[PDB]
Amino acid sequence: HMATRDLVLLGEQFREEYKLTQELEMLTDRLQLTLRALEDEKKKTDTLLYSVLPPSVANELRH
Amino acid sequence: GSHMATRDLVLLGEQFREEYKLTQELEMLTDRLQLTLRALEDEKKKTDTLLYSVLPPSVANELRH
């Protein structure tokens, strides 16, 4: 017993779930970009931390 | 000797706070992810109910086991 109402409404349910997965994709895309921004910031911080050291000590830490 | 001048110290302080700003954005985004997942769970149970509801009760009961 699937009337026209139930069929239309099932169609609308699928569409609502797609809007939500589209939001999940946008969020995860942004999360990956913000992680990359953190990686880039960290590279700068790390450089600054090495820069204040005596070179033989810096050398020793780099491995 | 080491050479951490006042400039280097101040800048390192600025590096740390720039990084906290980024981790705060990461926490916000992850919060929104979990909120969006919860809305999807809520929507999925409505869809699920609709799909059971159109079946003969016996069939739905049988699938529910």
Residue numbers in the entry:
A (entry chain B): 346 to 408
B (entry chain A): 344 to 408
Which statements did the authors publish about this structure?
The soluble guanylyl cyclase (sGC) is a heterodimeric enzyme that, upon activation by nitric oxide, stimulates the production of the second messenger cGMP. Each sGC subunit harbor four domains three of which are used for heterodimerization: H-NOXA/H-NOBA domain, coiled-coil domain (CC), and catalytic guanylyl cyclase domain. The CC domain has previously been postulated to be part of a larger CC family termed the signaling helix (S-helix) family.
We determined the crystal structure of the Rattus norvegicus sGC CC domain (residues A348-K409) to 2.15 Å resolution using SeMet single-anomalous-dispersion (SAD)-phasing. Crystals were initially obtained of the wt sequence but the SAD phasing required the introduction of an additional Met residue via the I371 M mutation. Four sGC CC monomers come close together to form an apparent four-helix bundle in an anti-parallel arrangement with two of such tetramers in the asymmetric unit. The CC monomers A and B (and the equivalent CD, EF, and GH) form an anti-parallel CC dimer. The side-chain directions of a-helices follow a heptad (a-g) repeat in that residue i and i+7 face the same direction. The CC dimer interface is formed predominantly via the a-d pattern residues and the a-d assignment, as obtained from SOCKET, is indicated in Figure 1B.
